[PDB]
Amino acid sequence: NDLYHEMIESGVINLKDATSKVALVYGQMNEPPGARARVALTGLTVAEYFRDQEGQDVLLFIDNIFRFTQAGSEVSALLGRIPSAVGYQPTLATDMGTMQERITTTKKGSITSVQAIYVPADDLTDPAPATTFAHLDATTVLSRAIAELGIYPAVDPLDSTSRIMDPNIVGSEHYDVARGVQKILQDYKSLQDIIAILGMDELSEEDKLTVSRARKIQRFLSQPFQVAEVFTGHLGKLVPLKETIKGFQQILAGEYDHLPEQAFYMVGPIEEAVAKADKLAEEH
Amino acid sequence: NDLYHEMIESGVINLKDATSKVALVYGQMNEPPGARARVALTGLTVAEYFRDQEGQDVLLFIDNIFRFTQAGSEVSALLGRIPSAVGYQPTLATDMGTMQERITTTKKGSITSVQAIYVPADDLTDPAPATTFAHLDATTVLSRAIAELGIYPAVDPLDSTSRIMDPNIVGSEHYDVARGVQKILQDYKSLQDIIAILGMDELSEEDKLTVSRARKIQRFLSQPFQVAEVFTGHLGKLVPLKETIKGFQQILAGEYDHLPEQAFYMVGPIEEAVAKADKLA
Amino acid sequence: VGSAAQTRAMKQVAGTMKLELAQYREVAAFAQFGDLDAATQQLLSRGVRLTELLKQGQYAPMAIEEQVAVIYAGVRGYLDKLEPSKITKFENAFLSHVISQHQALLGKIRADGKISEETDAKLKEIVTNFLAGFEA
Amino acid sequence: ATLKDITRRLKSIKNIQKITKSMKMVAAAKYARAERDLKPARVYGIGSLALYEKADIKVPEDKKKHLIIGVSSDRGLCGAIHSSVAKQIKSEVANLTAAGKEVKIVGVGDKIRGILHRTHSDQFLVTFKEVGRKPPTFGDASVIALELLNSGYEFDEGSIIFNRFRSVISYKTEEKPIFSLDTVASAESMSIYDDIDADVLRNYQEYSLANIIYYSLKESTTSEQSARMTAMDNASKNASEMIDKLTLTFNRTRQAVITKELIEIISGAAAL
Amino acid sequence: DTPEGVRSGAGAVRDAGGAFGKKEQADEERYFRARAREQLAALKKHHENEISH
């Protein structure tokens, strides 16, 4: 209901005219297990019509595809199937593929599909999320620990992967900056274990510099969202790709080492990052 | 056999005149599984008569109620039932509730039920002990590790709970003392890992005070038992409640910080603790 | 948040209480004190004060205005000087004092649903006066 | 206690063990160096000691003020190296200040400073940092003593406290008095001494202060390094015991998980 | 050695969420919280300097 009302006021759905740009297929958890296992098929059928019959680009947004697999697990026993590992249906991968292979960009038309996948008990090794990894070109894993740290979005920098992450595709500078960010965060992860025993005032200056830069990068990863304006209270920001690359490259180089870490948290571009630091100094 | 003869000696079971005050129902482990699943009901029925018809307060002491559940699991397989988690009967909660619900104080009479519950593999997440928790006002959880350290009884200070631990029921002073003891023991547990790896040296002098006081409390929780005189060689000490509250007040405040922690082990009231401390010259 | 399912008066103090408590949780998880009064010791003292404020007894629900009053008292730093183990006594005493003497303040808070600047000034007066007179 | 939880704890303690072992190795190297030059420092300090060793000098009856020089490093993880020194300082300031002598403490060692920063901060005149990170030498003691004179505080009576190195495993918190005052330095003992004049006697006491600071530092540093090595070794041993227990628990839990999933699958099959 | 043996990784101390992980978390904060104050004060001095000039 929140999405339906939001799109009505946003204008994506027009109840008066016929310029609506988003169709809605809903089967909630209130629905029986059988219904929750075919709503995804109904939605993707609508998307397929918007791909084959009409040669247009479509965006299929599905929430908790996991429910597609889970609903099958709630009915396999009655269907008469011997339980598979953990408890999922024996026809897990086959049915998931049958659904997912349909959601692709054919030569006729394109379907950019964003699928939310619930990770049961935050266990990525669980069969339901594990199988869906192979069916997705770009994966963004949200870590609870980062969300506990407060970084929103909670994208795990060292777990998210994309097939187009190729210096030939994204460009050498983009690839280099991204890999440098990931490496510095890995080295920070390594350093934390040392910190726990030695103490922060015992590490070498290189170690302290690495920790500081990594923390700055982690804070700068956080970006206020327009949909999250109600939650955070900060206005939503959208950062262009060029500005993102430039800012992270500058932070890696160390041009903003003098700025406090707080300045990089919940900001947009690095221009907002430096500007925030000045405000804190004025309020110091 | 020991309890029967012990009660005969004490006079609780008189074999001459009807002055006996305790009835015995026994379903010991030698019995077949079916019998062990109903003996508790037999003792409950004979208790129920005294509760309702005679209108007299009764103390129903049952041993290893767990065995009642275990007997059910053994017969459930032969009764043609799909096994539940672990392997227990699918009717564990229902049959346990049916048995326990009958053991309750009513408006006719009162039954103070002391039921010993065995935890398999010292595991309290096992379905049998886990379900029993909901049917008990007061719960005492003995821990093997506490017994390993030597503290007897092995009651876990931070796991045992009760429903009359209310400041408007047990009293404000008593409530405050109990909560403070639990708090300091919890903080010591929180510092256990840092101790175990680094050493007590890498702690704040304030933290060392908490550790030192908490250990004294843990030792003072231990008490010589009258039925354990023949085991430990130390005479049992029945401590009145007021003495326990006052002693733990004194220990929490810091009055006996100078005393060694060993002086608090296997003692009665805190006076015996200070006497033992002086004895440790 | 329930799309603003919290009264405005509660929100005003709750946001800052939440931020302070988060910062206190992040910093005061060591128990191995070395020496930063301005940065840490200031923050963790406020965190302890707010935690004692959050502590509540059983079968004694507080009206939203009274919660706003006590959370105000703690979050404005008025109780920072108060002893960490005496915070609870201050909570009870201040609650009683407000309910008896300044019941009109509670009524205004409840009716408006928001602590205005004038109501804030009244609360400042009340808390400061009682805090000064808290310990005879 | 899921296998996940057991695994997490086991991995953490394994990392802790590795780090502590490497730290023990580094502390062992530093201790080997510190013991090496402790032998040259030893006789040099004995030269300072000889002053009151032969010219037996004692504080007359009482001094208006007093100086307590507690030496230690700024790096912990050395058992009670800092704790023992702080305890001795506290006992002395309790022992003194009853007679009226105004004790002042120079906390060479930020650890000593911090330990007494919350009780005896007033008594602290000047605290010297960057101690223990680098092997001490006379010039460092030169800086400490010179700044001590630059303070201008009348340290008529002085006392230096340090953990003298006894063995690779044992250290003693020795205290050496500093009879810096010219009056006490010029007692009956120096009646037979010829060329010494009051001015050069004050100079000699100053140089003695500097060199006794040097000698004390070398003893403390070696003791600190040895204690750190021992403590890290003990931490590694404790981690080893813990990981052994956790590995046993992990094996049991893993086997239990496999058995449980087997039982679930079998039960599902039979029910069909 | 043998792959079967459980292998630890970087960050395990913090991932555990135990006392040592919390100590590392708080210790990092205490250091950089102080560092930010020094950095912020230096920035304020820089701003005052450029205001003067």
Query: DSSP of A266-281, one letter per residue?
Result: S-SSHHHHHHHHHHHH
Interface test with C, best of B204, B205, B211, B252 (most C CBs within 10 A): B204
Which is it for strands A58-62 and B58-62: parallel, antiparallel or unpaired? Answer: unpaired
Q: Does A32 touch chain C (CB under 8 A)?
A: no
B-D Cβ pairs (cutoff 8 Å, strict): 28
Task: Judge whether B87 is closer than 8 Å to chain D, CB to CB.
Answer: yes
| Residues A284/A277, Cβ–Cβ less than 8 Å | no
φ/ψ (deg, to 5) at C94: -65, -40
Note whether B1 contacts C: Cβ–Cβ < 8 A: no
Q: How many CB atoms lie within 10 A of CB D195?
A: 5
Distance of CA A31 to the CA centre of its chain: 27
Q: Give the residue on C whose Cα is nearest the Cα of D111.
A: C34
Reported as type and span, the H/E element at residue A138 is strand A138-139
Which stretches of D117-235 are assigned E, i.e. beta strand? 158-165, 171-178
Asked if E18 and B190 come within 8 Å (Cβ–Cβ), the reply is no
Q: What is the DSSP letter of B61?
A: E
* Gap between the Cα atoms of A142 and B36, Å rounded: 53
Render the burial of A235-250: b for 16+ CB within 10 Å, e for the rest. Answer: eeeebeeeebbbbbbb
The span from the CA of E15 to the CA of E27, in Å, is 16
B193 contacts on E by Cβ (under 8 Å): 18-20
Asked whether A103 and A136 are in contact (CB, 8 A), the reply is: no
Strand partners, A58: A111
Cβ-contact A252, E21 below 8 angstroms: no
- Decide if C71 contacts C53 (C-beta within 8 A): yes
Q: Are A75 and A37 in contact (CB under 8 A)?
A: yes
Interface size A-C, in CB pairs within 8 Å, comes to 6
Does the distance separating the beta carbons of E36 and A260 come in below 8 Å?
yes
Q: Find out whether A83 and D265 touch, Cβ atoms under 8 Å.
A: yes
| C100 contact partners, CB below 8 Å, separation of at least 6 | none
* Residues of chain C by 3-state class (helix, strand, coil), percent to 5: 70, 0, 30
Separation between Cα atoms, residue A176 and residue A169, nearest integer Å: 12
Subunits adjacent to chain C (3 or more Cβ pairs under 8 Å): A, B, D, E
- DSSP secondary structure letters along A217-256: HHHHH----STTHHHH-SPP----HHHHHHHHHHHHHTTT
Per-position b or e across C71-82, b if 16+ CB within 10 A of its CB: bbbbbbebbeeb
- Resolution attained, angstroms: 3.1
d(CA C6, CA C8): 6
CA distance E53 to E36: 25
The one-letter amino acid code at A8 reads I
Tokens in use for B215?
Answer: 């250990």
Query: Per the omega criterion (within 30 degrees of 0), is the bond before B33 cis?
Result: no
Q: Yes or no: say if D246 and D17 are a contact pair by the CB < 8 Å rule.
A: no
Using CA atoms, how far apart are residues C132 and D18, in angstroms rounded to an integer?
A: 56
**Do residues E26 and C26 lie in contact, with contact meaning Cβ atoms separated by under 8 Å?**
yes
Vertex A249 angle, CA A245 and A253, to 5°: 175
CB contact under 8 A, B207 and C32: yes
Residue B190, classified by CB atoms within 10 Å of its CB into exposed (0-12), middle (13-18) or buried (19+), is middle
Please report, as a single letter, which amino acid is at residue C2: G
Assess contact for A237 and A223: CB atoms under 8 A: yes
Beta strands in A3-86 (DSSP E): 58-62
DSSP classification of residue A201: G
Residues closing a segment before a gap in chain C (C–N exceeding 2.5 Å): 34
Contact A82, D268 (CB under 8 A): yes
What residues are paired with D163 via a beta bridge?
D173
The residues on C that touch E, with CB distances below 8 Å, are 26-30, 32, 36, 38-40
Give D41-45 contacts, CB < 8 A, sequence gap 24+. Answer: D41/D214, D41/D215, D41/D218, D41/D219, D42/D215, D42/D218, D44/D211, D44/D214, D44/D215, D45/D211, D45/D212, D45/D214, D45/D215, D45/D216, D45/D218, D45/D219
What the block records as the tokens of D21 is 């072992």
Q: Coil, helix or strand for D263?
A: helix
Long-range contacts of B113-116 (CB under 8 A, 24+ apart): B113/B59, B113/B60, B113/B61, B113/B62, B114/B59, B114/B60, B114/B61, B114/B62, B115/B60, B115/B61, B115/B62, B115/B65, B116/B62, B116/B63, B116/B64, B116/B65
Chain C contact for B166 (CB, 8 A cutoff): yes
Determine phi and psi for B166, rounding to 5 degrees.
-120, 130
Residue with tokens 């010259």: B281
CB D145 within 8 A of CB D234: no
Residues 6 or more apart whose CB falls under 8 angstroms from that of D124 comprise D104, D105, D106, D107, D113, D116, D117
Distance set, CA B100 to CA B35, B59, B93, B94, B166 (Å)? 18, 15, 10, 10, 24
C58 is in an annotated binding site: yes
SS (H, E, C) chain E: CCCCCCCCCCCHHHHHCCHHHHHHHHHHHHHHHHHHHHHHHHHHHHHHHHHHC
Distance CA A193, CA E24 (A): 8
The nearest CA of chain C is from the CA of A43 a distance in Å of 28
| Tokens, residue E5 | 């043996």
Integer-rounded Cα Rg, in Å, for chain E is 21
Handedness of CA B217, B220, B225, B226 (dihedral sign): negative
- The DSSP element (H or E) to which A153 belongs, if any, is none
- 8 A C-beta contact, residue C70 and residue C13: no
Half-sphere exposure of D139 (CA within 13 A, CB side): 2
What is the token pair recorded at A182? 């990931």
| Residue located via tokens 């274990």 | A193
Is residue B102 within 8 Å of B48, Cβ to Cβ?
yes
Instruction: Give the phi and the psi of residue D32 in degrees, each rounded to 5.
Output: -60, -40
| Residue partners of D58: CB distance under 8 A and separation at least 6 | D179, D184, D187
CA distance B23 to B37: 19
B208, C33 contact by CB (below 8 A)? no
Partners of residue B192 in chain E, C-beta under 8 Å: 19
Give how far Cα C120 sits from Cα of C7, C69, C93, C115, D28, Å: 16, 10, 20, 6, 63
Q: Which residues, other chains included, contact B102 with Cβ-Cβ below 8 Å and sequence gap of 6+?
A: B41, B44, B48
Beta strands in chain C (DSSP E): none
The amino acid at residue A57 is: D
Closest to D10 (Cα-Cα) out of E27, E15, E24, A145: E15
Whether A86 has its CB under 8 Å from any CB of chain D: the answer is: yes
**CB contact at 8 A, A111 and A51:** yes
* Residue D67: φ, ψ to 5°: -120, 130
Phi, psi angle pair for A138, to nearest 5°: -115, 125
Q: Residue A66 is encoded by which pair of tokens?
A: 């996991």
Asked if residue C57 belongs to a known ligand binding site, the reply is yes
State yes or no: cis peptide before A120, omega within 30 of 0: no
C-alpha dist (Å) from residue C90 to A249, C49, C124: 53, 11, 16
Q: What is the distance between the terminal CA atoms of chain A, rounded to a whole angstrom?
A: 45
Q: Do D14 and E12 touch (CB under 8 A)?
A: yes
In the 3-class helix/strand/coil scheme, how is D138-158 assigned residue by residue? HHHHHHHHHHHHHHCCCCCCE
Of A196, A212, A262, the CB nearest to E20: A196
Main-chain dihedrals φ then ψ at residue A58, nearest 5 degrees: -120, 155
Question: CA D253 to CA D243: how far, in whole Å?
Answer: 15
Taking an 8 Å cut-off on Cβ atoms, the answer to whether A123 and D76 are in contact is: no
Q: How far apart are CA B223 and CA B147, in angstroms?
A: 12
CB-based contact B265:B194 (threshold 8 Å): no
Any residues with CB less than 8 A from the CB of E16 and at least 6 apart, and which?
Answer: D8, D9, D11, D12
- Collapsing DSSP states into helix, strand and coil, what is residue B64? coil
Integer Rg of chain D from CA: 27
Residue A224, both tokens: 């206020």
Q: Give CA D66 to chain center in angstroms.
A: 22
Q: Are strands B58-62 and B111-115 parallel, antiparallel or unpaired?
A: parallel
Distance from CA of B193 to the nearest CA of E (A): 6
Taking one residue from C and the other from E, the number of pairs with CB-CB distance under 8 angstroms is: 29
Cα distance between residue B197 and residue A190, in whole Å: 20
Q: What angle do CA A140, A142, A143 make, to 5 degrees?
A: 135
**DSSP one-letter code for D32:** H
Radius of gyration over every alpha carbon of chain C, rounded to an integer in angstroms: 15
Question: Chain B: nearest CA to D186, how far in angstroms?
Answer: 43
Residue contact B207–C58, C-beta within 8 A: no
CA nearest B191 in C: which residue? C31
Contact B197 D79 (CB under 8 A): no
